[PDB]
C-alpha cells in the first residue's frame, strides 16, 4: 500500500491522479489518494512524516519550490511604506535562519524610522529593497567575528543628503547588547558605495563570545546604502535625513522563543556614518536556536536558476537530508511567464521573450500589480531583455485577461500552465535568458517505499516528458473552464497518450 499526495489545487489534483493510475494499472500495490489543504509546504511535511502515520509517500514537487525547501529562503524583498505620523517609514518582514537540524527560526522584522534632524524628508511611495549577506570569517582574527558583504538595491516602479553617498564612504558600526541579562558589545569597521549598492564590513566582539550567534545580528548591524535607481531617488528616504540622520527601531520577534527589541541611530560624524545600536532581548530559552548557537552561519544566496542544477540540486540534496528521490521530470513548467494572443504570435514568429522584447510597442496592461512591484518580477526583468514597453497597465483579478481579448493590451503575465491560456487563445513565451525560477514538476517518493517496491521507479519514470505546458494547460482547463472531475481528465489522458 502506497500513499499519494495532493494539494488544494486542480493542477496538482490532475497529476497526482496521474501518478496514482499508473501505479494501479502497473503494479500489484495497492494506492490511496490523500488530499492536503494548503500551499506545497505540506505536501513536503506530510511526505516527511510517511504513509505510516497519516502522511504521504509519493506526491508531484516542482524544482523551484525544492530549492527554497531544501536549502532555506533567501533574504526577503522588504516593502518600506511612509509613516506620516513619524514623519518616516516603515516595514514588516520575515527573516529565515537555518537550523543545524535541518529546520528553520523565523523571525518577525517589525521596523519604524524617524529622522533626527527636523528639517523635511522624502515620504516614499511604498517600494522594495533587496539584499543579499555574504558571511565570512577572517582567517588570520582570533577573535569571535563575522566577515560581512552586502549588496541592497530599490525597486517597485517603471535629495541633498545623497549628494553625501557619492562615493565610497567610511562606516563604523557599534552596538551594546543585553540577551537574558548577558551583556555584550560588538564593534565594526569598513566601507559602502551606494551607487553600487556595495557594504564590507568586518564586526568583532569586544566582550569576548559573542552570547547569541552572528546571523542573529545582521538586520540590526545602514539601509542608506542602498541603491536606488535615477527614477526613484524621489523615494529614498534613508539619505534625504542625512547628515542628521534617523532612528531606527525594530522589534524581531523569534518564533517559539525570545524577541529582540532595538533603538539605533544611524548618522555621520564627520566623514564617516555611524550606526550607534542599543539591543535588548528578553525571554530566550536557555537551549532554544538562539542561547543554543545552533543556526547555520550563512543566508543562502539567491538559489539558481539554471533548470538542469536546480533539479541536480535538489535531487541531490533530498536525498542526503530526508532520504526523498526525485524521479524524473512529467515536462511542463509552471513558472512565471508572458503571454500573448496566438494570432501575433503567429504574425512575427515570436517562440522567445528576446523576441517579444525588440518591441517597443504593445503594453503589458495584463500584468497584475505584484507582477510590477516585486523586484524579481518585472522590474528585474526590465533589466535583463532590456523591455520597453510604450505603457504597463495595473489590472488585477482578472479583468487583465478581458483586456488583451478587446486588443487594448497585447502582452499579459501568467502562469505557464494557466488554463484560461486556452480559453483565450494565447501564446507562452520561453524565457531563453532564464531569469524566473524554474518550477518543473518532477513526482518525488520516500526511499524505504522505493526499497520496498523497487518497480515504483520505472513505472513513474515512464511519465518522463510525458506532460508539455500546453497539454497541462488544455488539462487545467477540462476541470476549471468546463467542470470534468480531475479523476476522469487524468484517466483519459493517459488512456490517449497510450500510458494505460
Known sequence: TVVVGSINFTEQIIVANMVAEMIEAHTDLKVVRKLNLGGTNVNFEAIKRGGANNGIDIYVEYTGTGLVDILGFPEPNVYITADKQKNGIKANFKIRHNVEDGSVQLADHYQQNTPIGDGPV????????????????????????????????????????????????????????????????????????????????????????????????????????????????????????????????????????????????????????????????????????????????????????????????????????????????????????????????????????????????????????????????????????????????SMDMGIRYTAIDNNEVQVIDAFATDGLLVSHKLKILEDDKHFFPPYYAAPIIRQDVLDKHPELKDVLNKLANQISDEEMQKLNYKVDGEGQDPAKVAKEFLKEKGLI
Open 122 to 393: 522624502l515620504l516614499p511611495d511604498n517600494h522594495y529593497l533587496s539584499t543579499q549577506s555574504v558571511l565570512s570569517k577572517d582567517p588570520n582574527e582570533k577573535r569571535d567575528h563575522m566577515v560581512l558583504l552586502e549588496f541592497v538595491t530599490a525597486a517597485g516602479i517603471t535629495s541633498k543628503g545623497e549628494e553625501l553617498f557619492t562615493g565610497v564612504v567610511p562606516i563604523l558600526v557599534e552596538l551594546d547588547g543585553d540577551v537574558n541579562g548577558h551583556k555584550f558589545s560588538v564593534r565594526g569597521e569598513g566601507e559602502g558605495d551606494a551607487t553600487n549598492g556595495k557594504l564590507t564590513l568586518k564586526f568583532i566582539c569586544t566582550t569576548g563570545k559573542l552570547p547569541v550567534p552572528w546571523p542573529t545580528l545582521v538586520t540590526t548591524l545602514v539601509q542608506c546604502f542602498s541603491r536606488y535607481p535615477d527614477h526613484m531617488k524621489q523615494h529614498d528616504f534613508f539619505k534625504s535625513a542625512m547628515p542628521e540622520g534617523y532612528v531606527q527601531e525594530r522589534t524581531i520577534s523569534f518564533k517559539d522563543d525570545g524577541t529582540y527589541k532595538t533603538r539605533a541611530e544611524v548618522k555621520f560624524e564627520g566623514d564617516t556614518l555611524v550606526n550607534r545600536i542599543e539591543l535588548k532581548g528578553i525571554d530566550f530559552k536557555e537551549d532554544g536556536n538562539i542561547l543554543g548557537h545552533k543556526l547555520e552561519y550563512n543566508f543562502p544566496p539567491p538559489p539558481t536558476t539554471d533548470p538542469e542544477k536546480a533539479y541536480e540540486t535538489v535531487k541531490k540534496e533530498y536525498k542526503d537530508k530526508w532520504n526523498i528521490v526525485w524521479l524524473k521530470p512529467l515536462g511542463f513548467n509552471n513558472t512565471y511567464t508572458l503571454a500573448v494572443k496566438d494570432e501575433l504570435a503567429k504574425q512575427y514568429n515570436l517562440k522567445t521573450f528576446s523576441d517579444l522584447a525588440k518591441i517597443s510597442d504593445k503594453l503589458i496592461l495584463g500584468a497584475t500589480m505584484e507582477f510590477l512591484e516585486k523586484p524579481d518580477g518585472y522590474p528585474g526583468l526590465q533589466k535583463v531583455y532590456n523591455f520597453k514597453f510604450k505603457h504597463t497597465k
